Amino acid sequence: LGYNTVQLWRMRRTANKLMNGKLTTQKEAALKKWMASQQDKFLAKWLKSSSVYPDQVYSKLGLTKLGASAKSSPNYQLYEKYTEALLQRWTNFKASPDTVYKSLRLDKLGAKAPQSPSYPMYEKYLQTFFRN
Amino acid sequence: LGYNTVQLWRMRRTANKLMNGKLTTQKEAALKKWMASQQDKFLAKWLKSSSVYPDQVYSKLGLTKLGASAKSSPNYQLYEKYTEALLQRWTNFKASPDTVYKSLRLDKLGAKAPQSPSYPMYEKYLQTFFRN
């Protein structure tokens, strides 16, 4: 059992407890206090890894499962702050959309690439790259 | 006004007569013979031109307004032979998907590019380019 697997399991678990609500005032704060202390550390770990990418982080944070209610999870803003950092990096590189497509591992999905939760991010980068 | 415009207008009008079912046997044969005689010539002209691209041909052949039933027009298969030739050209050159994107002029459509009748062709070339 790995540290990252357990921690992520705990962040998915904590997110459900916050989405259900009806928590004691001190209990909800103690959960939100523990979540806030995991933001910087997970965001920095994901940015330094060569194997971590958005579709994987989406899955490990519980957002894939949530489907259309993914934005209701406390972990959405964390995933958001991660993709924001990636787009900032790729823009500083002036990466081409074809390079971004491989960063997002969309090449491995074949014909299912358009169904990826990363796909709207890829399309926006591609359009912005080419908007004269 | 111009010869090219008039010929394309006859291709659209001849296509409508076939689809509309009012022709005798002999008039049907004669319209289909005339249409066949235009096939190689239009194909060569569009492939030789640097300013002709699929979305444009699709419109000048009357397909855009047909939507999904565009395949019912006799001109659909002329359009398809044109995009087959393009796809085989770009595949032989090993042109990158980013290059294919601006060959299709999808860059001019910005956030509306995904609604382009050429978009599935782009997505297919892109997926096929990065397979393994």
Side-chain angles (χ1 to χ4, degrees):
Chain A
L1 241 198
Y3 173 84
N4 282 108
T5 294
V6 173
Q7 285 316 97
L8 290 163
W9 178 89
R10 294 173 79 184
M11 298 206 65
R12 274 170 275 153
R13 183 188 183 79
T14 299
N16 294 327
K17 286 200 162 200
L18 295 163
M19 292 172 59
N20 283 18
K22 290 176 282 285
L23 306 164
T24 99
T25 294
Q26 175 52 34
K27 180 75 184 194
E28 166 178 345
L31 292 175
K32 282 147 74 184
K33 181 165 187 157
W34 175 91
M35 291 279 289
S37 62
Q38 308 273 322
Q39 300 288 293
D40 298 7
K41 299 186 182 177
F42 267 124
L43 177 141
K45 179 167 195 70
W46 293 333
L47 293 163
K48 59 90 190 177
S49 169
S50 311
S51 47
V52 165
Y53 57 96
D55 282 357
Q56 204 186 339
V57 177
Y58 210 71
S59 204
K60 293 190 293 191
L61 282 175
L63 306 173
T64 307
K65 206 178 181 185
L66 285 172
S69 58
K71 278 200 183 176
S72 57
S73 166
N75 291 317
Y76 195 86
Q77 57 85 25
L78 173 51
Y79 170 83
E80 200 59 44
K81 284 165 60 189
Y82 167 66
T83 49
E84 294 185 282
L86 285 173
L87 299 165
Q88 183 83 43
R89 161 203 295 177
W90 299 336
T91 300
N92 287 332
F93 294 158
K94 309 188 177 287
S96 69
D98 285 331
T99 294
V100 166
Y101 196 80
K102 298 177 278 188
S103 299
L104 294 172
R105 268 61 159 199
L106 284 166
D107 55 319
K108 289 157 112 153
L109 294 199
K112 298 172 175 202
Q115 283 77 273
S116 154
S118 286
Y119 205 75
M121 169 175 40
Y122 162 73
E123 286 183 305
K124 178 165 282 315
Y125 188 90
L126 164 75
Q127 297 154 11
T128 319
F129 191 88
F130 283 107
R131 182 170 299 114
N132 279 35
Chain B
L1 228 193
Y3 172 90
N4 185 40
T5 299
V6 171
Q7 291 306 85
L8 297 166
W9 173 98
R10 296 171 57 186
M11 301 257 67
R12 287 190 309 273
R13 175 185 183 83
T14 294
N16 287 319
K17 300 205 136 186
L18 289 171
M19 299 183 274
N20 289 349
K22 302 183 192 178
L23 301 161
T24 72
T25 304
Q26 299 181 31
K27 296 162 188 168
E28 188 106 352
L31 283 195
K32 280 178 182 166
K33 182 183 177 157
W34 181 86
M35 290 248 278
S37 316
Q38 311 296 316
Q39 215 84 174
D40 298 341
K41 253 136 59 180
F42 274 116
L43 251 179
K45 179 186 190 296
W46 300 332
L47 287 172
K48 193 190 175 163
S49 181
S50 55
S51 59
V52 167
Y53 59 95
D55 276 357
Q56 201 183 76
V57 177
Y58 206 68
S59 186
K60 305 195 282 195
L61 288 180
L63 309 177
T64 318
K65 278 122 175 188
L66 292 179
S69 60
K71 295 202 178 72
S72 68
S73 177
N75 286 328
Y76 188 86
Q77 55 77 36
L78 174 50
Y79 170 75
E80 284 301 325
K81 275 179 300 197
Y82 168 56
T83 63
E84 282 171 335
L86 283 185
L87 289 167
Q88 183 157 46
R89 177 200 289 166
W90 302 330
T91 308
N92 284 328
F93 289 152
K94 307 193 181 286
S96 84
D98 282 337
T99 296
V100 161
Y101 199 68
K102 41 191 192 66
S103 285
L104 303 169
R105 274 67 170 172
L106 297 176
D107 60 300
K108 319 224 97 161
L109 310 186
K112 300 184 175 202
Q115 292 82 70
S116 168
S118 286
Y119 207 71
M121 170 182 176
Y122 167 71
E123 282 179 318
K124 200 180 183 311
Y125 188 92
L126 163 80
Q127 294 153 19
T128 297
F129 184 88
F130 289 114
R131 194 109 61 199
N132 303 33

